[PDB]
Structures are given as C-alpha cells and as structure tokens.
UniProtKB/Swiss-Prot annotation:
Protein name per the record: Serine protease 1
Subunit structure: Interacts with SERPINA1.
Localization of this protein: Secreted, Extracellular space
Co-factor binding comment: Binds 1 Ca(2+) ion per subunit.
Active site: 40 (charge relay system), 84 (charge relay system), 177 (charge relay system)
C-alpha cells in the first residue's frame, strides 16, 4: 500500500497473509474454512496466516493453517486477469474470535464514488521498494466505469473496477495482491493489477467480487 496508514493490530480481522516460506499475497477470510484471494496468487504449497499484524514477528494472536485445496476460477485468464479470483480451503477451521473474523460477501455491487478500505503488506513506494512488516490500510473511492476504461483502454472487463486517485500518490501495490477491498462492510474487491503503483492516471484495478458470489457459494457447498 502506497500512501496509506498503519491499520492497527488486528483491526482488519478478515485480512490473511498467504505464505510459501515468505508472505507473497493477501486474502480475505469469508468463513471459518475458506479464503478468497486472486487467481494470479496461485502457488502450490500455501500456508494461510490469520490474526497477523507484524508478519515477521510471532506476536501471539496468529493462527497458521495449511491450505488443503485451492480453486482458481474456471474462466481465469492470466493474460488479461479477467476473473482474477481464487478460493483456498483451510485444512482445519479457524477459531473465530475478535482478531480472526470473516467478512461478508456482498448482495449488491458497490457504487461508483463509494470509499472502500484496501489493506495489505505490499510495497509502500511508487518509485522503488520498501515492504512493511505491519499491516497497512488505505481508503480509496471506486471510480466510474468510464474513468477506469479511459485509464486502461481496451483492458477493463465487466469483472473489474478501478479504485483510487487519478492524481497519484495513494494505491495498492505488489504484495497486496489477493487482499480485500471492503465497501459498506462487505468484500467488494480483490487487489488485482495496475500500471505501476500510485502513478498519475493509473488507478488500481480490482476483481469485482459481486459477480462471483454464486460461484463462491456453489463451490463452498461442494468442497
Ligand atoms: Ca505475526
């Protein structure tokens, strides 16, 4: 997250870190057994880390639970990032508590202009590299479809939305991928892509979770 703020320990209790020997992507806990992340975060060999604040210190509220299964969306296209969504099943259910909690799936799609909370352990610099240890947060508004398409001509599908600031300075970034965009208390987006981070006229692009609720529900009813 570039231009964000330190969230505060466990104030984003649905945020997970995906670890394959190191943090590599975020995700969102949607119930005690299942995480939503980005399909481009697929790796074999994922441990889900819940209850994290500093990802490099064991502070006492973590649960580390291996994945048993990962399910990339059946229509994921890694070239265009259309349908950039994946489900990860935990080998054992998390113990839900004040620091490890699920986020609701949406009923309606969020609206242009809504301010959402985006979070992660990704890079904090637009130019160069600096990875935080503690979770960072950013409030960013959803941009209109038309503004998103102008920023990325020929690249935005109906399964994507843009959020952020066309002046630059505030955005998600590498290492935030797969993490949450929460609007009105529900999971509306997944950190997916963008041209650099926090650059002018190049806002973040996010997987539009409301288009996937029926896939998510039928998949978790079956696995
Ligand atoms: Ca920790």
């Amino acid at each position: 997250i570039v231009g964000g703020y330190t969230c505060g320990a466990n104030t984003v209790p649905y945020q997970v870190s995906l670890n394959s020997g190191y943090h590599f992507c975020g995700g969102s806990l949607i119930n005690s057994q299942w995480v939503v992340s980005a399909a481009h975060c697929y790796k074999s060999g994922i441990q889900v880390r819940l209850g994290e604040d500093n990802i490099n210190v064991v502070e006492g509220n973590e649960q580390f639970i291996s994945a048993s299964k990962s399910i990339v969306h059946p229509s994921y296209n890694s070239n265009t990032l259309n349908n950039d969504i994946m489900l990860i099943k935990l080998k054992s259910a998390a113990s839900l508590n004040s620091r490890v909690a699920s986020i609701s799936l949406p009923t309606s799609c969020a609206s242009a202009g809504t301010q959402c909370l985006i979070s992660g352990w990704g890079n904090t610099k637009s130019s160069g590299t600096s990875y935080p240890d503690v979770l960072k947060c950013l409030k960013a508004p959803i941009l209109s479809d038309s503004s998103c398409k102008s920023a990325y001509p020929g690249q935005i599908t109906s399964n994507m939305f843009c959020a952020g600031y066309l002046e630059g300075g505030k955005d998600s970034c590498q290492g935030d991928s797969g993490g949450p965009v929460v609007c009105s208390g529900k999971l509306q987006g997944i950190v997916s892509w963008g041209s650099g981070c926090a650059q002018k006229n190049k806002p973040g692009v996010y997987t539009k979770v409301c288009n996937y609720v029926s896939w998510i529900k039928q998949t978790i009813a079956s696995n």
